[PDB]
Amino acid sequence: GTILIDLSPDDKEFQSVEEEMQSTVREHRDGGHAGGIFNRYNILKIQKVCNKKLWERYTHRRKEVSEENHNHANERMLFHGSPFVNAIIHKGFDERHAYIGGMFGAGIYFAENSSKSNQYVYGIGGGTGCPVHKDRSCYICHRQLLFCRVTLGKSFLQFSAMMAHSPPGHHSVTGRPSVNGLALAEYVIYRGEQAYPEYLITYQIMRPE
Ligand SMILES: Cc1cc(=O)[nH]c2cc(-c3ccccc3F)ccc12
Numbered sequence: 001g002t003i004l005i006d007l008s009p010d011d012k013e014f015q016s017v018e019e020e021m022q023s024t025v026r027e028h029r030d031g032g033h034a035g036g037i038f039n040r041y042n043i044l045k046i047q048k049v050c051n052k053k054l055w056e057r058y059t060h061r062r063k064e065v066s067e068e069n070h071n072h073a074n075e076r077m078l079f080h081g082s083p084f085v086n087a088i089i090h091k092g093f094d095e096r097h098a099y100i101g102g103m104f105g106a107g108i109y110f111a112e113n114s115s116k117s118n119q120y121v122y123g124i125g126g127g128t129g130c131p132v133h134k135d136r137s138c139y140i141c142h143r144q145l146l147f148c149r150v151t152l153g154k155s156f157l158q159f160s161a162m163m164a165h166s167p168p169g170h171h172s173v174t175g176r177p178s179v180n181g182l183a184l185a186e187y188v189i190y191r192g193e194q195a196y197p198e199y200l201i202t203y204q205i206m207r208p209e
C-alpha cells in the first residue's frame, strides 16, 4: 500500500524539509559518539510517503485526540530515526518501535533536533554504526530519517536533567531538556496511530572542514 514520491530539489517542499534538517543540527554531549561528528548533511533524496490506510488510521486517531482536547490536535512535524525505517513506512508505527528504557517511559520517541534522531539511525546509542564499516561516524554510507506528522494532544510536560500508558488525561509526553539551553525537545507517544511518517529523507553526514 505504500508508495514513495520523489520530491525534486527545485520544489519548495524539498527545500523546506531540507531546511528543517539542516537548521536543527546541534552539538551532542556525547561528542558525536552515537551519531557521528558533523555540522551539516548532504541530502541525497527526499520522498513523500503515501499510504491511504496508514493515513486514514492517523487522521482517525487525530480527530479522537482533537475532540478530547478542546478541539486541539497539537500536531507537530518531528524527526524519527530508527533501524526500522523501512518497516515503519510500510506498516506504520507500533510497540516494536517503542523505547522500553526511555527517560519518559515506554513509547515512540520523536525529536525536534534532526541530529538527535540521527543518533538512533543505527539503533539505541548508534548501535555498532553503519553495517558496512561499523562506523557510528560513517561519512560514506547512506542514512535515512523520517520527518513525521505527530499528534500530541494534551502533552504532559516533563523536564529532564539533559508500551506504557500516557499520564492520566494526557495524550503524550514532552521531554524538555532543562540543562542544555540549546537542546530542543523530544516527545513520546503511546499509540502507533498518533504518528504518520510523511517524509523519508536519505542523506549522509558531512565531515567538518
Ligand atoms: C529519542 C529517539 C529519537 C528518535 O528519533 N528515534 C529513537 C528511536 C528509538 C528506538 C527504539 C526502539 C528500537 C530502536 C530505536 F532506535 C529510541 C529513541 C529514539
Ligand SMILES: [Zn+2]
Binding pocket: 130, 131, 132, 133, 134, 135, 138, 139, 140, 141
Ligand atoms: Zn559505512
